[PDB]
Design a protein around this ligand. Structure first.
Ligand SMILES: CCCCCCCCCCCCCCCCCC(=O)OC[C@H](COP(=O)([O-])OCC(O)COP(=O)([O-])OC[C@@H](COC(=O)CCCCCCCCCCCCCCCCC)OC(=O)CCCCCCCCCCCCCCCCC)OC(=O)CCCCCCCCCCCCCCCCC
Ligand SMILES: CCCCCCCCCCCCCC(=O)OC[C@H](COP(=O)(O)OCC[N+](C)(C)C)OC(=O)CCCCCCCCCCCCC
Ligand SMILES: CCCCCC(=O)OC[C@H](COP(=O)([O-])OCCN)OC(=O)CCCCC
Ligand SMILES: CCCCCC(=O)OC[C@H](COP(=O)([O-])OCCN)OC(=O)CCCCC
Lengths: 105, 50, 49, 34, 446, 61, 425
């Protein structure tokens, strides 16, 4: 909407490229630490996203073993990073918080 | 973190309170008896001696 | 045929307070439990000493 | 508890003619609960 | 609109009268075109000796098979032709015969009940017929693991007493019970003061009392020549019975402690506790999300096909506990979780879950007394046990008293550090040893 | 029909594990005094005037 | 004096969108509500068999206003109940609770029926329940006989099973459940029934939350009777068998004649352990059969069809003898050998049985709910008994004539070595 919230994105694009998981062809949600909430969200993914997530992670563990990265052409662009897991994950948390609010009635 | 503060959890606290204060009596008395802590054992009447 | 079953008599092993099949067992439930748990308490006393 | 009615774990066997009356069906219904 | 409290006052009070000979006549009027009337009797296996056990069950087979005024099948014809239904049952303490019929058929229905009780044919040829029938019914019952394991619970828990006996009696007694044994049972136990003529439906209490004085005047007077059955107390025995049978696909377990009795106020609070634990089988919908931890865990981890809590009442005693059905490798886990919930309610019951158990009992009570038959049953039974009808307004009051402190005090009184009775049947190699079961009845942390 | 001593001990001390353990630790404390008191009294009554506790009065000065 | 109050009258309303509301205020301590829908298994086709079964198991799944967790815990906290009963014609969502908590359970009932989400994973976890639920039902040999009986009788619609076919378990999709509720849970197909609730509340609820259009108009997918037979050779100890012919659709006067004919022949026992002296079929079979058996008239009446006949249980060797003895006994009635005292006795049983079936709230609510869907009206019992009394003895005979001469349907299971085919009768 403005120029101030636009360099805010510029420093988030900066941190994104510095974090460097896009150099392994990975997306932000591929790097989330699996807890009980996350393991449930992954369980709920449709077959296409689950299989894609499996291969991207497998491709990255392969690269990490060789201490290599993908060509710059194949890095995950900050603009094209689909937060595919947070919708499922946010509903998992929402359900858990409901149980927790009932548990103290 | 704050899952455990609400109506039911303060009821559980008040249910197990009488028990925990007794296990503190077991431990405290057990600590006095094992180490022969003389500062406490003087006021109790019968054990006074040796 | 499972109604032909009857539990055998245990009077050779029952304690005195129980052999009366027409007297409640709850009248002696606290004295009988207390006697067996008194054995345990005095045992741990000696191990404690 | 689930139900199936129609008269208007090894379960149990039927042998005599007195315990067999009431078994012949007389339209099915299927019910489910919590 | 009307509230729940206001609706409980709107039930008509059961009108109660007593005849000159001892019989008690009780009715709850409604606006129904149908009704049920029946006779409830203080009779059952607990009154029988080992030598005539199973007699009253023999009588049940013969009650509808003929009478002096309507011999043979004449009794079936009369009720079937007026569209009525005729039934009976026998527990260890109570015996009942009742009819469902139109309200206009009440005077004939009362007449038939009177003719069944008083004037019974008992032809020696019908007996020999009903003898082979009962033996077949016994072979049938042997395949109901549920009915077996509860007869086993009674057998071990009340060993040495009349309550240990089954209602049906042993096969040996069936084969030698004579007509003299049966008439002796009837003449002793079927006396006016120990009976209740209960009715429920569209009918004025005046009418029911008139028919009682007409068709039940011939009963035996108040005195009975000094030979009254006085039920002695029945010793409860902490004990265990295991019938190992690995050829059966699923194991049945029943476990209980001694309960107070019929007219003890503790039963209310106990029923609230049993409702928290509740019941379950594999066809329920809730599964993981059920309130009861026992239910939720059993569905999630698949520890059983079904379980149910119970509070079986008798005079000055009872059986309080649970029963379940599971795979042979799940018995230990089921008993662990079961006992853990008993212990948890003894020591740390919370107010919220007790409100749920209270509401579950409220719902269970109203919806059970829905229809002419279950009201007439509650009339008849309640007068043999409480000596009066307890209105729903009173039951609600005895419930609202219950809070978390009440269930903890009441449960500890009957569950905590008490010797249970256990009964097992099926592939029960993994059934925990009795000492392990007995140690599950207390918590070292408490 | 007053409950015997064993029944009143159970109702008051043993039913709860905590109170059951409290009286073990207290039972140990008072048992220790009276046992070493009485036991030592036997060991020396047997060996009266045989060891230093008895002849301590001769060589005071 | 100890008398009951003025019994209020049932109130009834038809909204212009087709929805039906019926309420009664019995001032009872508990309240019962039901949403009856024309969505039974007849409305499945051969590309989505079993959808209405899985739908019947999915009432506790997640809706838009209530998580799966909240439905289960909300209802149980009040001690209430939520049930789903299904016929080949209707589904019935029933709710029970104390009258102070009707607000809560109505909200749950509406979310289940109006706002199910059918989430892909919840549906997936539920498919194994079909196998369990069907396995329990088929523990009764009657269940598979009746299912096979309808599959042999009809070409479509009523041929469909209440229980999901084995090949469909795991394959019922969330889309099929969505389409099924869209096509069948419409105002024109629904009835909202309530005991212990006032009529203005139900009407308000109905106008606000149960105005759903579209889907499928009351389709004329007429059940086409066909006749046939299905034979299941198994290792049961007894042979169960049913023999029927097309009879009469419910509501018509011919159906009342069939109901009366049922109680002439023998529907069920009225006395415990009795010989059933007034059961025409039982005595007919018992004459030439001195082994254990059972026999009962079978009557099933549907919106556009019906099946009538009898149902037999016998030793495998006595199968045909029991069948043929039962059939000849019906032939006797078709030949006009029927006394008038036997009809007045059957009308007594049927009248008495009907009133008994509506003593309780659950039986009363079911009759009102199914009356509303089948007939669009409520018919009090005094008028029902009038319609029964209007049955003449010739109507009963003609009903038995329609059975003898009509194309038959048979289902049997057991050791069928001595169980006749249709053409051998
Ligand atoms: C010396 C070190 C002492 C270590 C003590 C450990 C205390 C502990 O783990 O608390 C659990 C335990 C929980 O038991 P619970 O409340 O009855 O509940 C049972 C569970 O549901 C679970 O109950 P369960 O049915 O699953 O298991 C019953 C279990 C219950 O008992 C235990 O769990 C004891 C754990 C082993 C302690 C080893 C002692 C050394 O009994 C055992 O199996 C232990 C048998 C040991 C045989 C060793 C032979 C040599 O709590 C206590 O007993 C604490 C009181 C101890 C007093 C300390 C004195 C100061
Ligand atoms: C820093 C200083 C701290 C000092 C702390 C002092 C604390 C002293 C100990 C007190 C703890 C008492 C706990 C307790 O008694 O429970 C343990 C079990 C339970 O006995 P049990 O009668 O099964 O159940 C009692 C149930 N109740 C409470 C409802 C009546 O009781 C028994 O069963 C125990 C009896 C056997 C004891 C022997 C074990 C030692 C190993 C073997 C010794 C000989 C060869 C090495
Ligand atoms: C953690 C190990 C404890 C070891 C203590 C020890 O060895 O014993 C010394 C004192 C003796 O009591 P006191 O009255 O002579 O007092 C002498 C004072 N110096 O006993 C105590 O005071 C017990 C205190 C325990 C606290 C954890
Ligand atoms: C310092 C205190 C340690 C307490 C150990 C303990 O109580 O173990 C369990 C059993 C008795 O409990 P339970 O088996 O009845 O189970 C109760 C279930 N609620 O006791 C024994 O027999 C174990 C012997 C240990 C010897 C090393």
């Amino acid at each position: 909407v403005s120029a101030s919230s636009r360099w805010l994105e510029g420093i988030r694009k900066w941190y994104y490229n510095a974090a460097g998981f896009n150099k392994l062809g990975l997306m932000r949600d591929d790097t989330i630490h699996e807890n009980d909430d996350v393991k449930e969200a992954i369980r709920r993914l449709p077959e296409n996203l689950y299989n894609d997530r499996v291969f991207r992670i497998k491709r990255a563990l392969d690269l990490s073993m060789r201490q290599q990265i993908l060509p710059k052409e194949q890095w995950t662009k900050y603009e094209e990073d689909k937060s595919y897991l947070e919708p499922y994950l946010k509903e998992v948390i929402r359900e858990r918080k409901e149980r927790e609010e009932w548990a103290k009635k | 973190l704050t899952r455990f503060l609400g109506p039911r959890y303060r009821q559980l606290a008040r249910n197990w309170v009488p028990t925990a204060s007794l296990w503190g009596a077991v431990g405290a008395v057990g600590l006095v008896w094992a180490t022969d802590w003389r500062l406490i054992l003087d006021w109790v009447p019968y054990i006074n001696g040796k | 045929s499972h109604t032909d079953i009857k539990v055998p008599d245990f009077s050779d092993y029952r304690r005195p307070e129980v052999l009366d099949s027409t007297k409640s067992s709850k009248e002696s439930s606290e004295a009988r439990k207390g006697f067996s748990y008194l054995v345990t308490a005095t045992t741990t006393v000696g191990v404690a000493y | 508890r689930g139900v199936a009615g129609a008269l208007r774990d090894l379960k149990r066997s039927v042998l005599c003619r007195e315990s067999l009356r009431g078994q012949a069906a007389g339209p099915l219904v299927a019910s489910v609960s919590l | 609109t009307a509230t729940y409290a206001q609706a409980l006052q709107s039930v008509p009070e059961t009108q109660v009268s007593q005849l000159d000979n001892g019989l008690r006549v009780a009715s709850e009027q409604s606006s129904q075109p149908t009704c049920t009337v029946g006779v409830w009797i203080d009779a059952g296996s607990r009154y029988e000796s080992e030598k005539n056990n199973g007699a009253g069950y023999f009588v049940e087979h013969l009650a509808f098979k003929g009478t002096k005024n309507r011999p043979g099948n004449a009794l079936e014809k009369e009720v079937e032709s007026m569209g009525a239904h005729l039934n009976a049952y026998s527990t260890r303490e109570h015996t009942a015969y009742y009819i469902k019929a139109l309200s206009k058929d009440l005077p004939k229905a009362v007449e038939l009940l009177a003719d069944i009780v008083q004037n019974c044919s008992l032809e020696d040829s019908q007996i020999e017929k009903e003898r082979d029938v009962i033996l077949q019914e016994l072979q049938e019952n042997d395949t109901s693991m549920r009915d077996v394991v509860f007869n086993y619970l009674h057998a071990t828990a009340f060993q040495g007493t009349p309550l240990a006996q089954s209602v049906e009696g042993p096969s040996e007694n069936v084969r030698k019970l004579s007509r003299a044994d049966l008439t002796e049972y009837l003449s002793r136990h079927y006396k006016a003061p120990r009976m209740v003529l209960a009715a429920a439906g569209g009918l004025e209490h005046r009418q029911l009392l008139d028919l009682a004085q007409k068709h039940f005047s011939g009963l035996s007077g108040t005195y009975d020549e000094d030979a009254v059955p006085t039920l002695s107390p029945c010793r409860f025995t902490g004990s265990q019975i295991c019938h190992r049978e690995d050829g059966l696909p699923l194991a049945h377990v029943a476990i209980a402690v001694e309960g107070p009795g019929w007219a003890h106020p503790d039963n209310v609070a106990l029923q609230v506790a049993n409702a928290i634990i509740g019941h379950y089988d594999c066809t329920y919908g809730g599964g993981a999300h059920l309130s009861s931890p026992l239910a939720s865990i059993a569905a999630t981890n698949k520890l059983c096909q079904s379980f149910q809590t119970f509070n079986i009442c008798y005079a000055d005693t009872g059986l309080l506990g649970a029963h379940f059905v599971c795979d042979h490798m799940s018995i230990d886990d089921m008993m662990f979780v079961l006992q853990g919930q008993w212990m948890r309610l003894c020591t740390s019951a919370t107010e919220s879950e007790v409100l749920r158990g209270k509401n579950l009992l409220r719902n269970a009570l109203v919806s059970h007394l829905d229809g002419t038959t279950p009201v007439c049953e509650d009339i008849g039974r309640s007068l043999l046990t409480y000596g009066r009808r307890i209105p729903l307004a009173e039951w609600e009051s005895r419930i609202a008293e219950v809070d978390a402190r009440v269930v903890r005090e009441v449960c500890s009184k009957y569950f905590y550090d008490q010797c249970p009775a256990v009964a097992g049947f099926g592939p029960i190699e993994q059934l925990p040893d009795y000492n392990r079961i007995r140690s599950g009845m207390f918590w070292l942390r408490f | 029909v007053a409950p015997t001593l064993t029944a009143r001990l159970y109702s008051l001390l043993f039913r709860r594990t905590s109170t059951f353990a409290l009286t073990i630790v207290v039972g140990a404390l008072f048992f220790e005094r009276a046992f070493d008191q009485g036991a030592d009294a036997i060991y020396e009554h047997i060996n009266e005037g045989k060891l230093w506790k008895h002849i301590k009065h001769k060589y005071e000065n | 004096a100890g008398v009951p109050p003025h019994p209020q009258d049932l109130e009834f309303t038809r909204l212009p969108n087709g929805l039906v509301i019926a309420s009664l205020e019995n001032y009872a301590p508990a309240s019962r509500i039901g949403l009856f829908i024309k969505a039974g298994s007849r409305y499945e086709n051969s590309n989505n068999l079993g959808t209405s079964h899985l739908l019947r198991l999915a009432s506790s799944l997640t809706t838009k206003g209530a998580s799966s967790f909240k439905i289960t815990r909300g209802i149980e906290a009040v001690g209430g109940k939520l049930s789903v009963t299904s016929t080949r014609e209707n589904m019935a969502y029933t709710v029970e609770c104390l009258r102070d908590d009707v607000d809560i359970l109505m909200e749950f009932l509406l979310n289940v029926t109006t706002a199910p989400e059918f989430r892909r994973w919840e549906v997936a976890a539920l498919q194994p329940q079909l196998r369990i639920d069907k396995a329990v039902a088929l523990q009764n040999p009657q269940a598979h006989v009746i299912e096979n009986l309808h599959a042999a009788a009809y070409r479509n619609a009523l041929a469909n099973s209440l229980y999901c076919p084995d090949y469909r378990i795991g394959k019922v999709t969330p889309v099929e459940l969505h389409d099924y509720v869209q096509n069948h849970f419409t105002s024109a197909r629904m009835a909202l029934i309530g005991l212990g609730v006032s009529h203005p509340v139900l009407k308000q609820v109905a106008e606000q939350f149960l105005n759903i259009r579209g889907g499928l108009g009351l389709s004329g997918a007429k059940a086409k009777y066909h006749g046939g037979e299905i034979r299941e050779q198994n290792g049961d100890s007894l042979v169960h068998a049913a023999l029927v012919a097309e009879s009469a659709a419910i509501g018509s006067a011919e159906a009342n004649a069939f109901s009366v004919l049922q109680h002439v022949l023998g529907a069920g026992p009225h006395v415990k352990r009795g010989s059933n002296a007034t059961s025409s079929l039982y005595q007919a079979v018992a004459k030439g059969v001195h082994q254990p058996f059972d026999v009962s008239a079978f009557n099933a009446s549907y919106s556009d069809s019906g099946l009538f006949g009898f149902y037999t249980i016998s030793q495998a060797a006595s199968a045909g003898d029991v069948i043929k003895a039962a059939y000849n006994q019906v032939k006797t009635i078709a030949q006009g050998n029927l006394s008038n005292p036997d009809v007045q006795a059957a009308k007594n049983k049927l009248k008495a049985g009907y009133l008994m079936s509506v003593e309780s709230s659950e039986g009363f609510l079911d009759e009102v709910g199914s009356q509303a869907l089948a007939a669009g009206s409520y018919t009090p019992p005094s008028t029902v008994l009038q319609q029964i009394d209007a049955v003449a003895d010739a109507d009963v005979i003609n009903a038995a004539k329609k059975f003898v001469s009509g194309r038959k349907s048979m289902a049997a299971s057991g050791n069928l070595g001595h169980t006749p085919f249709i053409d051998e009768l």
